[model samples]
Target chain A: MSGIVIDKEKVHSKMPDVVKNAKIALIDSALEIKKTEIEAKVQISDPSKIQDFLNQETNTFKQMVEKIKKSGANVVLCQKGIDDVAQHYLAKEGIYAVRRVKKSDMEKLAKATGAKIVTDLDDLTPSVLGEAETVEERKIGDDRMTFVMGCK
Target chain B: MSGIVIDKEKVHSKMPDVVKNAKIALIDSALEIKKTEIEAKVQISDPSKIQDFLNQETNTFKQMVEKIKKSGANVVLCQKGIDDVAQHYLAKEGIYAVRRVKKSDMEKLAKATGAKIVTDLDDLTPSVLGEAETVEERKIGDDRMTFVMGCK
Candidate 1:
């Protein structure tokens, strides 16, 4: 009962907050690249080809966002970079996302969210998300950082 | 005696084969923030205040570039974001700079570059940088990634 109430229903991407009964998700790898089955290379450095390559690169991030959404995760504390394109999609999804989280911080989040550090993207489920009451993005010092009220 | 052979000398923000005897410095955190001891917070939620905030942010990034140049490290592998303004400086300095590197990749880079990950920026010295034979950035996949041709 001695808690700063941040009604879960009020949490938004730009204005984030935690729900006491919410689940958190953690990703240990960069969602910006291919996990497997990537092939070949070219050194032509073609101007027209660069366009295709960028489109391909951007799709991986877009797909990543879709997967996170499909997996029922509303909070993503990724220990890797989320490219600008994917970050834009994450914002659009209204799913709180924090990228480039430190490893120690990831472990702490795992404990606080009660969510296991998921290894496989395809296998992620709602059950893997940890429990927590308060997750908010606050202005800490001169930076906007995520603060999870969960203990472990 | 064996390592990946990446002959990408054409890569800009550039470099030489100093890595053969090169000293590399790895920063594990964001370079865009005031040094410890400077602490204050303000919020105006955009509007006119946004300009000042951006200016302050730009200054921090500019200062970070200055510190990096003064550190005597030729190649920088950072595990955080680098604002465009700072990136411009890095390029101008012709210092091979890579940002938003993954933790695992950082470990591998340490092995590849014979560099130590320096946590205390203020305490970092030229001797703290790692060694290697050839370190250069290459256009890999859809992006340009740095390759440290280690001396191992």
Candidate 2:
């Protein structure tokens, strides 16, 4: 690999590659619905309550995508899994997101792209975001990979 | 110190005491506006932009308060300082809140109240919330103290 190569594929098919001056955000946290911390059983007797919970989760995912947009990140690489709802929102915002990135790969991306690996979504700001000249997906041999190149 | 005595006073004077069966949420995180992780200087030439940022901070504080209410926590004790906006919302909801509680006191409260010390607001749930028979502020000599009594 000439540049920083990511093993994971893009989260959405509709997500386009960044051609020039791509602002990248490397996230270590998950973009999915938060699970209950304690081992407690939640008995949802009402079906409407379950729907309401899902709606709230959707709103939360939307906010997570909005944060990435506000940070001016054109490309996102998460070390953990990204929710389907978050992927849809990112696709709508024209953000290229890749999920389930390895920790070693994340460190390499940080080194290549000059972006800090953000552990918290609240800490995702424009200043912490990294930059690259181009970010594209390439099919190398039998596997597809993400290429982040032309960095300072 | 008959029961669990917290040295800090209530955030708001108008906040009422729980007479019986109090649900307590022990939070370690700050209930105020989040600070930027990187040492980035943001120059706001436009006055309206400052107002807009403040508005967003207010909304964030509202959500923090909403999380406490959603967990059915009637009493909140934070290891960090609680913002004025958060205090106002908690008081309006008749929640007795204490800010800047010591780590030792928080531990004592957790042991006595059977509540976990939550580091994140997202983890605050009904199952994690501790219960007590009474949560009242009382004058202990010169300083005021919060009493959490009758725990299992």
Candidate 3:
């Protein structure tokens, strides 16, 4: 079973290192809550406003994780960092997630797993998941490597 | 007439100072291309990849502008800076845009124009636009101020 290997590791310690019947989701965007890329000041006029902002931010991350879960994705390879909130939810969902995967490695994974890399979490669907028989991590010569085996 | 005055100006010179029957879009997010929050190295193996990336970035700004246009928004009040590409499109669409508006003013505009502040472009719709009989810029002494008159 020829597959692709990359130098990455699971984000959370509780996350399993090995999985079978892996439905891989290749994400081009980060799993973290997005902040607008501008220099602007936010006015916290009321104490409740701060909590409202936090709640909305948390909800955004929840929506992202829920989309991944709904897509039937068991393995996640992200091109950027996953927020702590997202990592907790993904671990609870028993999904193996890797972060900061280089673009070259992402391209290879797409080719090997036949999964299209999606930019937005809302676009992630079951049909977009790449099929693989098994995805496992191994300590090979003092370094851990992820191996996506028996990919379709 | 009851109206709201803001200490902000149009983003571009070509943008008209006055808009009648204004359908205002109050955006809480920036109009620029988004960049991932994580710090990671992007490997530019090929020259075409850079162009591909640029084209996609440009398209994102275009999509943002198109959403605002489709929403029938003739006046845009953004909480953050708009990219030059977006500025050009909004100008061509004959939309009056004001950038770097403070949170205080945005909140006031919400009350004045009856427009909901939208964070995502995809969620923007014609129904979300706020209505005003006339939105015009006036020069008070040496400073410019925006006035939203006869807001519904």
Top candidate, metric lDDT: 3
Report the C-alpha lDDT of model 3 over A64-139, residue by residue, as the tens digit.
6799989989999999988666777889999999999999989988988889999998999988789899998889
Model 1 accuracy (lDDT, Cα): 0.57
Worst 10 residues of 1 chain A by lDDT: A1-10
> Top model by TM-score, which number?
3
Structural similarity of chain A in candidate 2, as TM-score: 0.85
lDDT of 2 by residue, A1-152 (tens): 23687776787878985547789999998876433310011132131132233334445656766899999898999998886667777898889999989999999888877889999898999988788888888788898888888874
For model 3, name the residue pairs that clash: none
Note the Cα lDDT for every prediction shown: 0.57, 0.75, 0.78
lDDT of 2 by residue, B51-86 (tens): 233334446656766999999999999999886667
Candidate 2 vs candidate 3, lDDT winner: 3
True contacts kept of each: 0.00, 0.00, 0.00
How many collisions per candidate?
13, 0, 0
**Where does candidate 2 chain A have its weakest 10-residue lDDT segment?**
A37-46
- After superposition, candidate 2 runs with Cα above 4 Å error: A1-152, B34-48
Give one digit per residue, the lDDT tens place, for model 3 in B118-142: 9999989988788899999989989
The TM-score values for the models, in the order shown, are 0.40, 0.46, 0.48
Ranking by DockQ: 3, 2, 1
